[PDB]
Amino acid sequence: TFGPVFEDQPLSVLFPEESTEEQVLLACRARASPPATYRWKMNGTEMKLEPGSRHQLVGGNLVIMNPTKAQDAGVYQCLASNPVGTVVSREAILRFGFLQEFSKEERDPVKAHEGWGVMLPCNPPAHYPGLSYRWLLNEFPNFIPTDGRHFVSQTTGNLYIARTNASDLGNYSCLATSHMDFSTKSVFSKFAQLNLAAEDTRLFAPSIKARFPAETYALVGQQVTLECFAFGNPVPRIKWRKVAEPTLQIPSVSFEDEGTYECEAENSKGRDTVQGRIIVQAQPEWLKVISDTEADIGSNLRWGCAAAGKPRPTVRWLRNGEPLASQNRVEVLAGDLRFSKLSLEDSGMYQCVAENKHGTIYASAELAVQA
């Protein structure tokens, strides 16, 4: 006979607001002898799963009836125990995917001058997760092309023109698109009128008005997009370097791509520059983990775990899914479990828990003290 070994664990779920399914599963199972009983935790609080209930346990599996952001969004964790002891699953995040439509309330007039640079605000509906942004001239689907006189941000979704013309006269609408697992959804706004008053004849050294953060935090492998677009006359040219498009794309980052990046808006009259720093981070991943150990009574044990990733993660310890700190019999150091002479009250499940700002991983094993 033996203690619980996880055969499947809950993974984070993006339940789309809408949906046909009137429920949401969070999987969990463990092989154990005798058969393993299950418990659940939400946001750190334990779950009441009861008879005539809405939070239903189906043999290890958590099934939540009619889920809502306002009631169900959060962090869930499975707990698998039997006479031998408890182990705890990875945390799974339950999030809700939605996109509202723009207000049927008309847009604020945005009037500028010909030759002047002008920004048109998207100001988009409530949404999760992040969106694509395109803009529309007069009708649908009459798209604005991104060419250098035009720029649509993928943060704010605001349209930018560096210099206005006679060709830019018309009505404008922001089209927000959400991409999720089984559905794309595009919503667009009421049409704002761009009025263009008397032509300015003057020239302006470029001013960057679409910047990118002082610092940008990304994981290894992530796509990275820094935005840099500038007002100016004549139409400024975007230049990038490490210390020719307005957005610098990094298809998959390695650690080398860390450092200060510089954007140069430069027309013939001057140059505006902007500097930001990319920090390359990484998830905790298991370098070494504890194994099911069979030990004699009164013996000693050197147990250990270590994890990679930036920043260097912190190794916790759990006994039967309970925060373990150093105590009479047991010694604790970062990722080290030293048993100063074993008792039978040690025969249980143990886990090491490595974690940083980016994630928390788990590794478990059974201790069996024998005579």
Side-chain angles (χ1 to χ4, degrees), residues 189-237:
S189 79
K190 280 273 196 160
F191 283 79
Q193 179 139 72
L194 181 87
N195 313 287
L196 290 168
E199 182 210 44
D200 208 335
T201 76
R202 272 160 287 218
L203 299 151
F204 313 102
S207 173
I208 303 165
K209 312 282 270 174
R211 327 238 292 186
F212 53 89
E215 283 163 1
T216 290
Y217 300 84
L219 293 168
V220 160
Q222 297 287 339
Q223 254 217 22
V224 151
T225 297
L226 295 178
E227 302 188 351
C228 193
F229 194 85
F231 284 156
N233 179 29
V235 172
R237 294 207 166 202

mmCIF file of all heavy atoms in Angstrom, residues 189-237:
data_model
loop_
_atom_site.group_PDB
_atom_site.id
_atom_site.type_symbol
_atom_site.label_atom_id
_atom_site.label_comp_id
_atom_site.label_asym_id
_atom_site.label_seq_id
_atom_site.Cartn_x
_atom_site.Cartn_y
_atom_site.Cartn_z
ATOM 1 N N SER A 189 -16.715 50.794 -33.225
ATOM 2 C CA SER A 189 -17.352 51.973 -32.626
ATOM 3 C C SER A 189 -18.221 52.802 -33.565
ATOM 4 O O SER A 189 -18.254 52.580 -34.776
ATOM 5 C CB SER A 189 -16.275 52.891 -32.032
ATOM 6 O OG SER A 189 -15.633 53.657 -33.042
ATOM 7 N N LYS A 190 -18.918 53.768 -32.972
ATOM 8 C CA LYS A 190 -19.528 54.856 -33.716
ATOM 9 C C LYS A 190 -18.425 55.662 -34.397
ATOM 10 O O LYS A 190 -17.287 55.719 -33.912
ATOM 11 C CB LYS A 190 -20.335 55.759 -32.782
ATOM 12 C CG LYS A 190 -21.710 55.232 -32.413
ATOM 13 C CD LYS A 190 -22.744 55.641 -33.443
ATOM 14 C CE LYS A 190 -24.151 55.479 -32.898
ATOM 15 N NZ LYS A 190 -25.135 56.289 -33.671
ATOM 16 N N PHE A 191 -18.770 56.283 -35.519
ATOM 17 C CA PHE A 191 -17.790 56.987 -36.343
ATOM 18 C C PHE A 191 -17.544 58.434 -35.911
ATOM 19 O O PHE A 191 -18.437 59.285 -35.986
ATOM 20 C CB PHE A 191 -18.171 56.903 -37.827
ATOM 21 C CG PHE A 191 -17.866 55.567 -38.450
ATOM 22 C CD1 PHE A 191 -18.713 54.479 -38.253
ATOM 23 C CD2 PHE A 191 -16.723 55.397 -39.226
ATOM 24 C CE1 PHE A 191 -18.431 53.241 -38.821
ATOM 25 C CE2 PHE A 191 -16.430 54.162 -39.799
ATOM 26 C CZ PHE A 191 -17.290 53.082 -39.600
ATOM 27 N N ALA A 192 -16.320 58.681 -35.445
ATOM 28 C CA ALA A 192 -15.871 60.014 -35.052
ATOM 29 C C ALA A 192 -15.578 60.835 -36.294
ATOM 30 O O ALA A 192 -15.023 60.317 -37.266
ATOM 31 C CB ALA A 192 -14.626 59.920 -34.180
ATOM 32 N N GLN A 193 -15.955 62.111 -36.263
ATOM 33 C CA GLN A 193 -15.645 63.003 -37.371
ATOM 34 C C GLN A 193 -14.324 63.734 -37.145
ATOM 35 O O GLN A 193 -14.156 64.479 -36.135
ATOM 36 C CB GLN A 193 -16.781 64.002 -37.623
ATOM 37 C CG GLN A 193 -16.471 64.950 -38.764
ATOM 38 C CD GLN A 193 -17.657 65.196 -39.658
ATOM 39 O OE1 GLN A 193 -18.607 65.876 -39.275
ATOM 40 N NE2 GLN A 193 -17.605 64.653 -40.868
ATOM 41 N N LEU A 194 -13.394 63.510 -38.096
ATOM 42 C CA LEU A 194 -12.119 64.218 -38.083
ATOM 43 C C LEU A 194 -12.235 65.467 -38.940
ATOM 44 O O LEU A 194 -12.253 65.393 -40.172
ATOM 45 C CB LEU A 194 -10.985 63.320 -38.598
ATOM 46 C CG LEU A 194 -9.568 63.907 -38.638
ATOM 47 C CD1 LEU A 194 -8.854 63.713 -37.305
ATOM 48 C CD2 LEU A 194 -8.762 63.286 -39.766
ATOM 49 N N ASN A 195 -12.330 66.612 -38.275
ATOM 50 C CA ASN A 195 -12.403 67.897 -38.960
ATOM 51 C C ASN A 195 -10.997 68.464 -39.132
ATOM 52 O O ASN A 195 -10.200 68.453 -38.192
ATOM 53 C CB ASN A 195 -13.293 68.875 -38.182
ATOM 54 C CG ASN A 195 -14.615 68.244 -37.736
ATOM 55 O OD1 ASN A 195 -15.510 68.010 -38.549
ATOM 56 N ND2 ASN A 195 -14.735 67.974 -36.438
ATOM 57 N N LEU A 196 -10.687 68.940 -40.333
ATOM 58 C CA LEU A 196 -9.354 69.471 -40.602
ATOM 59 C C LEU A 196 -9.386 70.940 -41.002
ATOM 60 O O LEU A 196 -9.678 71.285 -42.153
ATOM 61 C CB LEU A 196 -8.619 68.620 -41.645
ATOM 62 C CG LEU A 196 -8.198 67.225 -41.165
ATOM 63 C CD1 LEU A 196 -7.761 66.358 -42.332
ATOM 64 C CD2 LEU A 196 -7.095 67.308 -40.110
ATOM 65 N N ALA A 197 -9.079 71.798 -40.032
ATOM 66 C CA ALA A 197 -9.076 73.245 -40.232
ATOM 67 C C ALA A 197 -7.882 73.701 -41.070
ATOM 68 O O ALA A 197 -7.150 72.874 -41.628
ATOM 69 C CB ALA A 197 -9.101 73.970 -38.886
ATOM 70 N N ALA A 198 -7.700 75.022 -41.139
ATOM 71 C CA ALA A 198 -6.657 75.667 -41.946
ATOM 72 C C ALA A 198 -5.288 74.975 -41.894
ATOM 73 O O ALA A 198 -4.793 74.618 -40.817
ATOM 74 C CB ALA A 198 -6.531 77.138 -41.563
ATOM 75 N N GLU A 199 -4.698 74.793 -43.074
ATOM 76 C CA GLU A 199 -3.411 74.124 -43.233
ATOM 77 C C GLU A 199 -2.284 74.906 -42.566
ATOM 78 O O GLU A 199 -2.123 76.107 -42.796
ATOM 79 C CB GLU A 199 -3.098 73.924 -44.723
ATOM 80 C CG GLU A 199 -1.784 73.191 -45.009
ATOM 81 C CD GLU A 199 -1.133 73.609 -46.322
ATOM 82 O OE1 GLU A 199 -1.082 74.826 -46.618
ATOM 83 O OE2 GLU A 199 -0.655 72.717 -47.052
ATOM 84 N N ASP A 200 -1.518 74.213 -41.731
ATOM 85 C CA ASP A 200 -0.287 74.752 -41.174
ATOM 86 C C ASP A 200 0.821 74.546 -42.210
ATOM 87 O O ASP A 200 0.953 73.460 -42.779
ATOM 88 C CB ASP A 200 0.054 74.040 -39.863
ATOM 89 C CG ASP A 200 0.854 74.907 -38.906
ATOM 90 O OD1 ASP A 200 1.549 75.848 -39.359
ATOM 91 O OD2 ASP A 200 0.789 74.637 -37.686
ATOM 92 N N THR A 201 1.601 75.590 -42.467
ATOM 93 C CA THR A 201 2.657 75.511 -43.475
ATOM 94 C C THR A 201 3.987 75.087 -42.850
ATOM 95 O O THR A 201 4.868 74.574 -43.539
ATOM 96 C CB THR A 201 2.825 76.850 -44.269
ATOM 97 O OG1 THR A 201 3.508 77.828 -43.470
ATOM 98 C CG2 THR A 201 1.462 77.407 -44.728
ATOM 99 N N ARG A 202 4.103 75.288 -41.539
ATOM 100 C CA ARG A 202 5.351 75.087 -40.796
ATOM 101 C C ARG A 202 5.837 73.636 -40.707
ATOM 102 O O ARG A 202 5.096 72.694 -41.008
ATOM 103 C CB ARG A 202 5.222 75.679 -39.386
ATOM 104 C CG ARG A 202 5.604 77.144 -39.298
ATOM 105 C CD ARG A 202 5.023 77.810 -38.066
ATOM 106 N NE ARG A 202 3.581 78.026 -38.188
ATOM 107 C CZ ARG A 202 2.944 79.103 -37.737
ATOM 108 N NH1 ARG A 202 3.620 80.078 -37.142
ATOM 109 N NH2 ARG A 202 1.631 79.213 -37.891
ATOM 110 N N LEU A 203 7.093 73.481 -40.291
ATOM 111 C CA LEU A 203 7.717 72.178 -40.105
ATOM 112 C C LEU A 203 8.022 71.951 -38.627
ATOM 113 O O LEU A 203 8.349 72.892 -37.901
ATOM 114 C CB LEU A 203 9.002 72.088 -40.930
ATOM 115 C CG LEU A 203 8.875 72.236 -42.451
ATOM 116 C CD1 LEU A 203 10.139 72.831 -43.039
ATOM 117 C CD2 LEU A 203 8.538 70.906 -43.117
ATOM 118 N N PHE A 204 7.911 70.698 -38.189
ATOM 119 C CA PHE A 204 8.134 70.336 -36.788
ATOM 120 C C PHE A 204 9.084 69.152 -36.657
ATOM 121 O O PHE A 204 8.877 68.111 -37.284
ATOM 122 C CB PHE A 204 6.807 69.998 -36.087
ATOM 123 C CG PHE A 204 5.705 70.989 -36.346
ATOM 124 C CD1 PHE A 204 4.700 70.702 -37.267
ATOM 125 C CD2 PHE A 204 5.669 72.208 -35.672
ATOM 126 C CE1 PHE A 204 3.673 71.618 -37.518
ATOM 127 C CE2 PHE A 204 4.646 73.130 -35.913
ATOM 128 C CZ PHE A 204 3.646 72.834 -36.838
ATOM 129 N N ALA A 205 10.126 69.322 -35.842
ATOM 130 C CA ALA A 205 10.986 68.213 -35.429
ATOM 131 C C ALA A 205 10.107 67.184 -34.718
ATOM 132 O O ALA A 205 9.166 67.565 -34.018
ATOM 133 C CB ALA A 205 12.089 68.710 -34.508
ATOM 134 N N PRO A 206 10.399 65.880 -34.889
ATOM 135 C CA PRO A 206 9.445 64.868 -34.434
ATOM 136 C C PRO A 206 9.266 64.852 -32.922
ATOM 137 O O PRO A 206 10.230 65.033 -32.184
ATOM 138 C CB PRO A 206 10.071 63.550 -34.910
ATOM 139 C CG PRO A 206 11.515 63.835 -35.025
ATOM 140 C CD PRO A 206 11.609 65.268 -35.465
ATOM 141 N N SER A 207 8.029 64.668 -32.474
ATOM 142 C CA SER A 207 7.765 64.398 -31.069
ATOM 143 C C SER A 207 7.124 63.017 -30.952
ATOM 144 O O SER A 207 6.079 62.765 -31.554
ATOM 145 C CB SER A 207 6.866 65.479 -30.462
ATOM 146 O OG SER A 207 6.470 65.136 -29.142
ATOM 147 N N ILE A 208 7.770 62.122 -30.205
ATOM 148 C CA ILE A 208 7.226 60.784 -29.946
ATOM 149 C C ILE A 208 6.070 60.908 -28.957
ATOM 150 O O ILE A 208 6.215 61.528 -27.900
ATOM 151 C CB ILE A 208 8.306 59.798 -29.415
ATOM 152 C CG1 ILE A 208 9.474 59.700 -30.403
ATOM 153 C CG2 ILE A 208 7.708 58.414 -29.169
ATOM 154 C CD1 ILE A 208 10.734 59.067 -29.843
ATOM 155 N N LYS A 209 4.921 60.343 -29.321
ATOM 156 C CA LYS A 209 3.719 60.442 -28.498
ATOM 157 C C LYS A 209 3.147 59.059 -28.219
ATOM 158 O O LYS A 209 2.195 58.904 -27.451
ATOM 159 C CB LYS A 209 2.685 61.352 -29.167
ATOM 160 C CG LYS A 209 3.252 62.688 -29.666
ATOM 161 C CD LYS A 209 3.470 63.719 -28.555
ATOM 162 C CE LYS A 209 2.230 64.583 -28.353
ATOM 163 N NZ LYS A 209 2.349 65.501 -27.185
ATOM 164 N N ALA A 210 3.742 58.057 -28.856
ATOM 165 C CA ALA A 210 3.444 56.664 -28.577
ATOM 166 C C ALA A 210 4.738 55.989 -28.135
ATOM 167 O O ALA A 210 5.536 55.538 -28.959
ATOM 168 C CB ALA A 210 2.868 55.988 -29.806
ATOM 169 N N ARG A 211 4.953 55.951 -26.826
ATOM 170 C CA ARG A 211 6.189 55.412 -26.267
ATOM 171 C C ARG A 211 6.028 53.944 -25.884
ATOM 172 O O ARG A 211 4.972 53.344 -26.085
ATOM 173 C CB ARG A 211 6.663 56.236 -25.053
ATOM 174 C CG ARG A 211 6.343 57.734 -25.119
ATOM 175 C CD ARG A 211 7.594 58.614 -25.026
ATOM 176 N NE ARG A 211 8.252 58.566 -23.718
ATOM 177 C CZ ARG A 211 9.283 59.333 -23.364
ATOM 178 N NH1 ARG A 211 9.792 60.219 -24.212
ATOM 179 N NH2 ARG A 211 9.810 59.215 -22.153
ATOM 180 N N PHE A 212 7.098 53.371 -25.350
ATOM 181 C CA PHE A 212 7.074 52.035 -24.787
ATOM 182 C C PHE A 212 7.707 52.112 -23.400
ATOM 183 O O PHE A 212 8.618 52.917 -23.184
ATOM 184 C CB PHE A 212 7.815 51.050 -25.691
ATOM 185 C CG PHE A 212 9.219 51.469 -26.039
ATOM 186 C CD1 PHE A 212 10.293 51.099 -25.228
ATOM 187 C CD2 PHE A 212 9.469 52.219 -27.186
ATOM 188 C CE1 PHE A 212 11.590 51.478 -25.546
ATOM 189 C CE2 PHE A 212 10.763 52.604 -27.515
ATOM 190 C CZ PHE A 212 11.828 52.235 -26.692
ATOM 191 N N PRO A 213 7.228 51.280 -22.457
ATOM 192 C CA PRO A 213 7.551 51.415 -21.034
ATOM 193 C C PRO A 213 9.031 51.585 -20.710
ATOM 194 O O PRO A 213 9.898 51.135 -21.466
ATOM 195 C CB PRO A 213 7.041 50.103 -20.444
ATOM 196 C CG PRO A 213 5.905 49.740 -21.318
ATOM 197 C CD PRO A 213 6.329 50.135 -22.697
ATOM 198 N N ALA A 214 9.297 52.248 -19.587
ATOM 199 C CA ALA A 214 10.641 52.376 -19.038
ATOM 200 C C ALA A 214 11.289 51.002 -18.914
ATOM 201 O O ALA A 214 12.445 50.816 -19.295
ATOM 202 C CB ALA A 214 10.592 53.069 -17.683
ATOM 203 N N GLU A 215 10.529 50.045 -18.388
ATOM 204 C CA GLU A 215 10.975 48.660 -18.304
ATOM 205 C C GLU A 215 9.886 47.715 -18.793
ATOM 206 O O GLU A 215 8.708 47.933 -18.529
ATOM 207 C CB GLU A 215 11.399 48.315 -16.874
ATOM 208 C CG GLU A 215 12.773 48.873 -16.492
ATOM 209 C CD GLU A 215 13.020 48.899 -14.993
ATOM 210 O OE1 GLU A 215 12.132 48.468 -14.228
ATOM 211 O OE2 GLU A 215 14.107 49.359 -14.580
ATOM 212 N N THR A 216 10.288 46.681 -19.522
ATOM 213 C CA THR A 216 9.353 45.684 -20.029
ATOM 214 C C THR A 216 9.769 44.304 -19.543
ATOM 215 O O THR A 216 10.907 43.884 -19.752
ATOM 216 C CB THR A 216 9.252 45.734 -21.574
ATOM 217 O OG1 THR A 216 8.588 46.939 -21.959
ATOM 218 C CG2 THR A 216 8.464 44.558 -22.126
ATOM 219 N N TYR A 217 8.839 43.610 -18.892
ATOM 220 C CA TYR A 217 9.111 42.301 -18.308
ATOM 221 C C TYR A 217 8.505 41.193 -19.154
ATOM 222 O O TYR A 217 7.296 41.183 -19.406
ATOM 223 C CB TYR A 217 8.589 42.240 -16.867
ATOM 224 C CG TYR A 217 9.224 43.273 -15.964
ATOM 225 C CD1 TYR A 217 8.731 44.580 -15.912
ATOM 226 C CD2 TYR A 217 10.330 42.951 -15.175
ATOM 227 C CE1 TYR A 217 9.319 45.536 -15.093
ATOM 228 C CE2 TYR A 217 10.925 43.902 -14.353
ATOM 229 C CZ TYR A 217 10.415 45.191 -14.316
ATOM 230 O OH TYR A 217 10.995 46.137 -13.505
ATOM 231 N N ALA A 218 9.355 40.266 -19.593
ATOM 232 C CA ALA A 218 8.930 39.162 -20.452
ATOM 233 C C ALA A 218 9.646 37.862 -20.107
ATOM 234 O O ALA A 218 10.784 37.880 -19.629
ATOM 235 C CB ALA A 218 9.167 39.512 -21.901
ATOM 236 N N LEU A 219 8.973 36.737 -20.359
ATOM 237 C CA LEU A 219 9.557 35.408 -20.155
ATOM 238 C C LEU A 219 10.321 34.938 -21.392
ATOM 239 O O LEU A 219 10.079 35.421 -22.502
ATOM 240 C CB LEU A 219 8.472 34.384 -19.800
ATOM 241 C CG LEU A 219 7.723 34.481 -18.467
ATOM 242 C CD1 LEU A 219 6.520 33.545 -18.476
ATOM 243 C CD2 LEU A 219 8.628 34.170 -17.282
ATOM 244 N N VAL A 220 11.250 34.005 -21.193
ATOM 245 C CA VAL A 220 11.942 33.343 -22.298
ATOM 246 C C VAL A 220 10.917 32.692 -23.230
ATOM 247 O O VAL A 220 10.038 31.954 -22.780
ATOM 248 C CB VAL A 220 12.968 32.297 -21.779
ATOM 249 C CG1 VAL A 220 13.328 31.277 -22.852
ATOM 250 C CG2 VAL A 220 14.216 32.993 -21.284
ATOM 251 N N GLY A 221 11.016 32.999 -24.520
ATOM 252 C CA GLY A 221 10.109 32.430 -25.510
ATOM 253 C C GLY A 221 8.943 33.321 -25.892
ATOM 254 O O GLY A 221 8.353 33.144 -26.960
ATOM 255 N N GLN A 222 8.606 34.278 -25.026
ATOM 256 C CA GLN A 222 7.516 35.220 -25.298
ATOM 257 C C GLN A 222 7.815 36.068 -26.527
ATOM 258 O O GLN A 222 8.978 36.359 -26.821
ATOM 259 C CB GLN A 222 7.279 36.155 -24.103
ATOM 260 C CG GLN A 222 6.828 35.480 -22.810
ATOM 261 C CD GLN A 222 5.393 34.987 -22.850
ATOM 262 O OE1 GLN A 222 4.584 35.450 -23.657
ATOM 263 N NE2 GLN A 222 5.069 34.047 -21.969
ATOM 264 N N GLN A 223 6.764 36.447 -27.250
ATOM 265 C CA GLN A 223 6.876 37.501 -28.246
ATOM 266 C C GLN A 223 6.947 38.832 -27.512
ATOM 267 O O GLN A 223 6.313 39.001 -26.467
ATOM 268 C CB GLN A 223 5.677 37.494 -29.190
ATOM 269 C CG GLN A 223 5.969 36.952 -30.586
ATOM 270 C CD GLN A 223 5.201 37.698 -31.681
ATOM 271 O OE1 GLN A 223 4.774 38.842 -31.493
ATOM 272 N NE2 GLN A 223 5.034 37.052 -32.831
ATOM 273 N N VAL A 224 7.725 39.765 -28.049
ATOM 274 C CA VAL A 224 7.890 41.083 -27.433
ATOM 275 C C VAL A 224 7.748 42.189 -28.472
ATOM 276 O O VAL A 224 8.406 42.163 -29.511
ATOM 277 C CB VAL A 224 9.232 41.185 -26.656
ATOM 278 C CG1 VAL A 224 9.761 42.612 -26.610
ATOM 279 C CG2 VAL A 224 9.061 40.650 -25.256
ATOM 280 N N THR A 225 6.877 43.151 -28.185
ATOM 281 C CA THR A 225 6.595 44.243 -29.113
ATOM 282 C C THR A 225 6.687 45.593 -28.406
ATOM 283 O O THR A 225 5.826 45.941 -27.597
ATOM 284 C CB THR A 225 5.198 44.072 -29.781
ATOM 285 O OG1 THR A 225 5.185 42.875 -30.565
ATOM 286 C CG2 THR A 225 4.873 45.243 -30.688
ATOM 287 N N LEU A 226 7.744 46.342 -28.706
ATOM 288 C CA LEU A 226 7.866 47.714 -28.222
ATOM 289 C C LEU A 226 7.340 48.675 -29.283
ATOM 290 O O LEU A 226 7.734 48.599 -30.455
ATOM 291 C CB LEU A 226 9.319 48.058 -27.861
ATOM 292 C CG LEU A 226 10.016 47.334 -26.702
ATOM 293 C CD1 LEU A 226 11.440 47.822 -26.586
ATOM 294 C CD2 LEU A 226 9.301 47.521 -25.375
ATOM 295 N N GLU A 227 6.447 49.571 -28.872
ATOM 296 C CA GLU A 227 5.869 50.541 -29.799
ATOM 297 C C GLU A 227 6.575 51.894 -29.723
ATOM 298 O O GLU A 227 6.906 52.375 -28.635
ATOM 299 C CB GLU A 227 4.365 50.692 -29.557
ATOM 300 C CG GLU A 227 3.606 49.380 -29.699
ATOM 301 C CD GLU A 227 2.097 49.531 -29.644
ATOM 302 O OE1 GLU A 227 1.608 50.636 -29.327
ATOM 303 O OE2 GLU A 227 1.397 48.529 -29.912
ATOM 304 N N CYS A 228 6.810 52.495 -30.887
ATOM 305 C CA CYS A 228 7.375 53.839 -30.955
ATOM 306 C C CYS A 228 6.963 54.572 -32.232
ATOM 307 O O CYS A 228 7.502 54.315 -33.312
ATOM 308 C CB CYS A 228 8.896 53.782 -30.830
ATOM 309 S SG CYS A 228 9.673 55.372 -30.539
ATOM 310 N N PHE A 229 6.000 55.481 -32.097
ATOM 311 C CA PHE A 229 5.533 56.302 -33.220
ATOM 312 C C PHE A 229 5.455 57.784 -32.842
ATOM 313 O O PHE A 229 5.087 58.130 -31.708
ATOM 314 C CB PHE A 229 4.182 55.800 -33.728
ATOM 315 C CG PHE A 229 3.776 56.365 -35.067
ATOM 316 C CD1 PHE A 229 4.226 55.781 -36.250
ATOM 317 C CD2 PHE A 229 2.914 57.460 -35.142
ATOM 318 C CE1 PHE A 229 3.834 56.284 -37.490
ATOM 319 C CE2 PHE A 229 2.516 57.974 -36.375
ATOM 320 C CZ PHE A 229 2.975 57.386 -37.552
ATOM 321 N N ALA A 230 5.785 58.648 -33.805
ATOM 322 C CA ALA A 230 6.004 60.067 -33.532
ATOM 323 C C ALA A 230 5.251 61.004 -34.462
ATOM 324 O O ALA A 230 5.146 60.742 -35.664
ATOM 325 C CB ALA A 230 7.481 60.376 -33.592
ATOM 326 N N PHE A 231 4.735 62.092 -33.884
ATOM 327 C CA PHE A 231 4.219 63.234 -34.633
ATOM 328 C C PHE A 231 5.394 63.945 -35.269
ATOM 329 O O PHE A 231 6.450 64.055 -34.649
ATOM 330 C CB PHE A 231 3.545 64.238 -33.698
ATOM 331 C CG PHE A 231 2.184 63.833 -33.217
ATOM 332 C CD1 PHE A 231 1.681 64.364 -32.034
ATOM 333 C CD2 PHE A 231 1.383 62.970 -33.955
ATOM 334 C CE1 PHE A 231 0.412 64.019 -31.570
ATOM 335 C CE2 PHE A 231 0.112 62.616 -33.500
ATOM 336 C CZ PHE A 231 -0.377 63.146 -32.304
ATOM 337 N N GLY A 232 5.209 64.446 -36.486
ATOM 338 C CA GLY A 232 6.251 65.231 -37.144
ATOM 339 C C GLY A 232 5.974 65.649 -38.575
ATOM 340 O O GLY A 232 5.114 65.077 -39.253
ATOM 341 N N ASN A 233 6.716 66.660 -39.025
ATOM 342 C CA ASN A 233 6.676 67.129 -40.407
ATOM 343 C C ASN A 233 8.085 67.537 -40.868
ATOM 344 O O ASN A 233 8.712 68.392 -40.244
ATOM 345 C CB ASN A 233 5.674 68.283 -40.554
ATOM 346 C CG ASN A 233 5.601 68.834 -41.974
ATOM 347 O OD1 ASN A 233 5.836 68.124 -42.951
ATOM 348 N ND2 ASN A 233 5.262 70.113 -42.087
ATOM 349 N N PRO A 234 8.593 66.911 -41.950
ATOM 350 C CA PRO A 234 7.937 65.873 -42.754
ATOM 351 C C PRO A 234 7.821 64.546 -42.009
ATOM 352 O O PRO A 234 8.475 64.359 -40.981
ATOM 353 C CB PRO A 234 8.861 65.734 -43.972
ATOM 354 C CG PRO A 234 10.192 66.148 -43.482
ATOM 355 C CD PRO A 234 9.944 67.221 -42.457
ATOM 356 N N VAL A 235 6.988 63.646 -42.533
ATOM 357 C CA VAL A 235 6.683 62.362 -41.891
ATOM 358 C C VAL A 235 7.951 61.661 -41.382
ATOM 359 O O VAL A 235 8.782 61.221 -42.184
ATOM 360 C CB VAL A 235 5.853 61.442 -42.830
ATOM 361 C CG1 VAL A 235 5.712 60.046 -42.251
ATOM 362 C CG2 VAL A 235 4.476 62.042 -43.072
ATOM 363 N N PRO A 236 8.108 61.585 -40.046
ATOM 364 C CA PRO A 236 9.300 61.007 -39.400
ATOM 365 C C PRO A 236 9.546 59.528 -39.721
ATOM 366 O O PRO A 236 8.614 58.803 -40.068
ATOM 367 C CB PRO A 236 9.025 61.199 -37.900
ATOM 368 C CG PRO A 236 7.558 61.430 -37.790
ATOM 369 C CD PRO A 236 7.133 62.086 -39.058
ATOM 370 N N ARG A 237 10.806 59.105 -39.616
ATOM 371 C CA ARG A 237 11.198 57.718 -39.878
ATOM 372 C C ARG A 237 11.673 57.060 -38.598
ATOM 373 O O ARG A 237 12.524 57.607 -37.892
ATOM 374 C CB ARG A 237 12.297 57.636 -40.944
ATOM 375 C CG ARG A 237 11.860 58.078 -42.332
ATOM 376 C CD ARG A 237 12.679 57.392 -43.410
ATOM 377 N NE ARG A 237 12.072 57.543 -44.732
ATOM 378 C CZ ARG A 237 12.300 56.736 -45.766
ATOM 379 N NH1 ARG A 237 13.123 55.697 -45.649
ATOM 380 N NH2 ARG A 237 11.695 56.962 -46.924
#
